Structure 1
Amino acid sequence: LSTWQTFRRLWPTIAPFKAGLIVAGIALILNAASDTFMLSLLKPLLDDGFGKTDRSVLLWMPLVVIGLMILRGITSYISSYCISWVSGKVVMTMRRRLFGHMMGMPVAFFDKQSTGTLLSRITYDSEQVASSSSGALITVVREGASIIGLFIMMFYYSWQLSIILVVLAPIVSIAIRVVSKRFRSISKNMQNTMGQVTTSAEQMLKGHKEVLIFGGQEVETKRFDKVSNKMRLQGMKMVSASSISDPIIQLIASLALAFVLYAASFPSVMDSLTAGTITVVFSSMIALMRPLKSLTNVNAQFQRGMAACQTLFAILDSEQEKDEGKRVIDRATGDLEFRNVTFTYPGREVPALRNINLKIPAGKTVALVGRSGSGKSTIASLITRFYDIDEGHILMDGHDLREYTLASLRNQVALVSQNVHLFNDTVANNIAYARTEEYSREQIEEAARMAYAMDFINKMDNGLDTIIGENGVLLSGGQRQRIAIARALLRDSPILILDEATSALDTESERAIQAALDELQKNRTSLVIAHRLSTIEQADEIVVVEDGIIVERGTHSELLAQHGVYAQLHKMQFG
């Protein structure tokens, strides 16, 4: 209905690759001509050949057959290659645009659904877009050409007979539609009263025990004999009706045939005719049925493919992360403060955090501590503006976070976890995620040294050049952790978020990990979702979170002496 809006929108991504469409359409028209020329040459076969018993006709005829067929194959390959090339580039451009758009959507959008199955729906629907629309272009250009061809040829070789057929065919098809509809109604009326009798009969084996006790078996057999005969007689009523439809339909079309032959008896018609031209006109008229049937499904196909293009424009039209921030931080000095921070995850009520006051001074390290839920993680995600807050403020160097540009803000923070973003590349270029040409191999080796990683790197194929496979296959949890540390070390990020909740703590050479973490925290601001005793007790401040509110605050022994929830968690070792 409105799918040409969708198409007019889509078009300027295609219009760069127009040439291949031009070409494809040409080759399709050629392919249609080649078809109808092959049909056309039944006339010389039956006249110039067998009518004049001229065996020279059957000599060239083979060479025109294999000729045309060679051309038809060539035109087919050209057309399907041009079409595939254009649809491939259109889907690739649309996939790239969609991806670049999503990389820049809210994290909310990313927490509704797995990206693994969103990019599956997207690659599939983009394929179905270019598939359905190019298939419709094909069957338009080609079946339109072949229809025009067969009509021209029909009327040329015998406009009288062609006018007869063109008139008869609609009447015959409308007579058939009318008859098979009148029979669909009669079949659904009988399937209703067959469904009832069948249900009735499928019930009457129940209450078997009552029957055995009372000895009513022969009675229930005489009830089934009757319902079975009734089922079978309804089966007959249905068959005798349905097996009449198709005889009458064929007799209807046969009357049209016999009528066409009777018309061809009259010389007004017969003088234009021969064996050749009659068989050409019947062949081309039968050949018309396929491209017409194709042409009445083209609309369904085109809208089916603009329906999938609707979803991709839906995704491209949904809104990106807010970045009205106007200030650019070179390097944050460090002082970082929550001030009455209240926050609700979108699409819920019951806040996740209430009235969070909290100051992390420059150089210092706060440890967040609490049970599973708590809100530990939410605070950290609020640091990077992965969401935005309902009430209060969060300050960096005495300005709100939202006054800074998302890029500047996120350039200051770094993150360390076990589930660090590893990807198919060298170690060197993982450690320098972006900024590969901005840090030399010397610097990257120093970052890997102080992260206690050259231990296991130098014991590996090509050292720092060693590739890390599909998803980062090779590295164990503690190696992941040390790589993440090397990364946060290499960029001298003024803030550090350290997530210990995911990372595992059995790991051989946890000593090395703590030694690197120690070197990392050195004179840099660091919020820590904490579970290592080692870092909790060493923390300049601790902040205890319960049900989204800070309950306790202070140093390790200061809070332990209070025998409160911090003590409860220290006894359980956090977990």
Structure 2
Amino acid sequence: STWQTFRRLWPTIAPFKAGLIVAGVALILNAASDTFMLSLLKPLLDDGFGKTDRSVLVWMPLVVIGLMILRGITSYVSSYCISWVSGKVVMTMRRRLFGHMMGMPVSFFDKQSTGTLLSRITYDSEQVASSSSGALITVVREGASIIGLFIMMFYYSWQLSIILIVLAPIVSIAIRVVSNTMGQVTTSAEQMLKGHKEVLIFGGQEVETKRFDKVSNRMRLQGMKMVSASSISDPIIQLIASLALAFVLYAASFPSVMDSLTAGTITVVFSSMIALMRPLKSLTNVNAQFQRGMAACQTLFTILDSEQEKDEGKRVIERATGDVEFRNVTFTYPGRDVPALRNINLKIPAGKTVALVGRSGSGKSTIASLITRFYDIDEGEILMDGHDLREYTLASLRNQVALVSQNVHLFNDTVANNIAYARTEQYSREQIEEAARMAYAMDFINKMDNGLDTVIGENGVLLSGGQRQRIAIARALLRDSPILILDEATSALDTESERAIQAALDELQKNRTSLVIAHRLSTIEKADEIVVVEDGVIVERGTHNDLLEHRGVYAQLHKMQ
């Protein structure tokens, strides 16, 4: 599979192969430079030390510098080439994953953590390029290094080289033979921090301290274990290699071997045996790093194979000044088969407010999800302006609907652009300031240092749940969407300046198709039609006179609130 993963990847790389092939040449030459420099080491001792002043002056210092210049350039070139390519493919895959994930359905987003998906973008893409680049570099240059070194070794003393060779199998096998709580740490600290208030009033300081003590000590020993394991592996490896060499030098004792040697040649031969010790290390490990790179890549490719939400509606409607009708609708969450909704018909007539109230258990919220077609439905139909929602392309329908809630997520931008999110160009700031004014956001805003152009960004998080909601109104207002989905289930139960919010929302709800998941009494009373939801079905509905005496469970709910 791993090479099958790679060949799927190669297309994204192929456009940049040119950088690879130049990088390859540069790597080869660097190995050549390093081999060539040990070559020089023979003349310095034989020719150089055989009473020749000329050698130690010209050939050595000037060539060594010459070679150093070539060593630097080539390394610079290869680094730049690799970096460039590595940067190019990392960027490309990050952009595909970003676009792909944004297009997925919300079902996709419920499965995985937002941190996991983010981890894919930041880390897993740079890792695959990293590991493959390291793999390629290691192969090419370390490949070149060892054959250049072995040639040279054999050339000046083939006897010793063939000794060393016959020992390589043994050394290879011997080197083979010796070669979670952190989550609990984060968990332990995090769970104390989530339960700080509870900890304070039951006096749970002692038990949490001991709990952390236990976890923190377990990880200390676990973290020690890994360091200790790594520590012993290589001391033996070098010991074993050393043995092989000790034996090689032992061989030099015998006249048959030694007579072909000088001070210069024996020096280079051993020098090149030690030079080998790192290439061989890198080349044994190359396959491992290549594997882990391809494992991350196949993860990415898994995500990229997942289907994005289907948008086959070919109908556009520029504005909906019309009702939404539900026809015998049933909907089930993917993953379980106890339907959140079973047979729902409700008519939000164009321009009037419908508030639906329900128990926490019921899917009052799921209805609101459905109209915006975050999830598609199992049975029945939803028609907006008489056409089924599915007949419309998603952009137009979603443009029709606006959402307002305490938990609408804020982008790190100028408050003004947050209000005119995704339509900064279209809306003149004159409007923006007005919409922020009407939603009674403006008093809180002007306290900011930059005001509207101040950014709630870079994790500043100056705003609070109450303040955000008034921006959500401002956003929905300014855009002037034909339909309102307003969620009050997020409790927001200890507000400071709720009056502002209420007047804002009345303005917003006015003469605007408003569908409301309501927990608040003012919205309830002034809604035109009220609908009760118990589990998956509409139990009853009631208007003004109907409100006074509930056929449904309004009385019991009214007592609660």
- Same fold by TM-score greater than 0.5: yes
Partner of 2:128: 129
Deviation track 1:511-534 (CA, whole Å, cap 9, x = no partner) reads: 222222122222221100011211
2:246 to 235, 258, 264: 258
1:569 shift after superposition: 1.2
1:400 shift after superposition: 1.3
- Of 405-414 and 256-265, deviating more is 256-265
1:437 shift after superposition: 0.6
Distance 2:207 2:320 in 1: 94
Deviation track 1:383-442 (CA, whole Å, cap 9, x = no partner) reads: 111111111111111121111111111111000111122122112111100111111112
- Of 466-475 and 347-356, deviating more is 466-475
Deviation track 1:462-495 (CA, whole Å, cap 9, x = no partner) reads: 4322222335622233332221111111112111
1:235–1:564 distance in 2 versus 1, CA, 3 Å:
closer
1:445–1:201 distance in 2 versus 1, CA, 3 Å:
closer
1:287 shift after superposition: 2.6
1:225–1:302 distance in 2 versus 1, CA, 3 Å:
closer
Partner of 2:496: 508
Distance 1:475 1:224 in 2: 33
1:461–1:55 distance in 2 versus 1, CA, 3 Å:
same
What secondary structure does 1:339 align onto? strand
Contact 1:422 1:472 (8 Å CA) reproduced: no
What are the residue-to-residue correspondences of 1:441-452 with 2, within 5 Å?
Answer: 441-452=429-440
- Of 316-325 and 214-223, deviating more is 214-223
- Of 150-159 and 41-50, deviating more is 150-159
1:349 shift after superposition: 1.8
Contact 2:406 2:490 (8 Å CA) reproduced: yes
Contact 1:36 1:149 (8 Å CA) reproduced: yes
Deviation track 1:153-205 (CA, whole Å, cap 9, x = no partner) reads: 223334455445434544676699899xxxxxxxxxxx999999999999999
Contact 2:42 2:265 (8 Å CA) reproduced: yes
1:175–1:500 distance in 2 versus 1, CA, 3 Å:
closer
Distance 2:450 2:223 in 1: 79
What secondary structure does 1:327 align onto? coil
Distance 1:372 1:213 in 2: 28
1:29–1:370 distance in 2 versus 1, CA, 3 Å:
same
1:3 shift after superposition: 2.2
1:42 shift after superposition: 2.3
Distance 1:411 1:114 in 2: 28
What secondary structure does 1:501 align onto? coil
1:444 shift after superposition: 1.6
Distance 2:416 2:205 in 1: 85
Contact 1:340 1:356 (8 Å CA) reproduced: yes
1:561–1:148 distance in 2 versus 1, CA, 3 Å:
same
1:104 shift after superposition: 0.9
Contact 1:477 1:503 (8 Å CA) reproduced: no
Contact 2:330 2:343 (8 Å CA) reproduced: yes
Contact 1:559 1:567 (8 Å CA) reproduced: no
1:79 shift after superposition: 2.9
What secondary structure does 1:544 align onto? strand
Partner of 1:91: 90
Contact 1:423 1:470 (8 Å CA) reproduced: no
- Of 478-487 and 226-235, deviating more is 226-235
1:6–1:248 distance in 2 versus 1, CA, 3 Å:
closer
Partner of 1:113: 112
What secondary structure does 1:523 align onto? coil
- Of 375-384 and 326-335, deviating more is 326-335
1:97 shift after superposition: 0.8
Contact 1:29 1:142 (8 Å CA) reproduced: yes
- Of 551-560 and 411-420, deviating more is 551-560
Distance 2:385 2:206 in 1: 95
1:227–1:153 distance in 2 versus 1, CA, 3 Å:
closer
Partner of 2:18: 19
- Of 7-16 and 243-252, deviating more is 243-252
Contact 1:560 1:566 (8 Å CA) reproduced: no
Contact 2:540 2:551 (8 Å CA) reproduced: no
1:44 shift after superposition: 1.0
Unmatched segments (≥5 aa) in structure 1: 180-190
1:366 to 354, 364, 378: 354
Deviation track 1:307-333 (CA, whole Å, cap 9, x = no partner) reads: 110000000001110212121111112
Partner of 1:147: 146
1:198–1:375 distance in 2 versus 1, CA, 3 Å:
closer
Contact 2:484 2:515 (8 Å CA) reproduced: yes
1:438–1:44 distance in 2 versus 1, CA, 3 Å:
same
Distance 1:411 1:275 in 2: 84
Distance 1:423 1:457 in 2: 16
Contact 2:541 2:552 (8 Å CA) reproduced: no
Note the aligned Cα RMSD (angstroms): 10.2
Contact 2:42 2:267 (8 Å CA) reproduced: yes
- Of 371-380 and 46-55, deviating more is 46-55
1:335 shift after superposition: 1.1
1:337 shift after superposition: 1.1
Contact 1:198 1:231 (8 Å CA) reproduced: no
1:109–1:261 distance in 2 versus 1, CA, 3 Å:
closer
1:60 shift after superposition: 5.4
Partner of 2:63: 64
Distance 2:414 2:292 in 1: 44
Contact 1:432 1:490 (8 Å CA) reproduced: yes
1:260–1:395 distance in 2 versus 1, CA, 3 Å:
closer
Deviation track 1:355-399 (CA, whole Å, cap 9, x = no partner) reads: 111111100111010121211100000111111111111111112
Distance 1:551 1:438 in 2: 44
1:150–1:555 distance in 2 versus 1, CA, 3 Å:
same
- Of 368-377 and 28-37, deviating more is 28-37
What secondary structure does 2:119 align onto? helix
1:217 shift after superposition: 42
1:215 shift after superposition: 45
Contact 2:43 2:264 (8 Å CA) reproduced: yes
- Of 564-573 and 248-257, deviating more is 248-257
Deviation track 1:1-20 (CA, whole Å, cap 9, x = no partner) reads: x3222222212322333343
1:32 shift after superposition: 1.2
Distance 1:210 1:284 in 2: 67
Contact 2:120 2:300 (8 Å CA) reproduced: no
Contact 2:164 2:245 (8 Å CA) reproduced: no
- Of 158-167 and 200-209, deviating more is 200-209
Percent sequence identity over aligned pairs: 96
1:306 shift after superposition: 0.7
Distance 2:38 2:430 in 1: 76
1:86 shift after superposition: 2.5
- Of 57-66 and 521-530, deviating more is 57-66
Give the TM-score taking structure 2 as reference length: 0.82
1:365–1:27 distance in 2 versus 1, CA, 3 Å:
same
Give the TM-score taking structure 1 as reference length: 0.80
1:526–1:207 distance in 2 versus 1, CA, 3 Å:
closer
1:63–1:411 distance in 2 versus 1, CA, 3 Å:
same
Distance 2:196 2:484 in 1: 75
What are the residue-to-residue correspondences of 1:334-353 with 2, within 5 Å?
Answer: 334-353=322-341
Unmatched segments (≥5 aa) in structure 2: none
Contact 2:405 2:486 (8 Å CA) reproduced: yes
2:390 to 363, 384, 402: 402
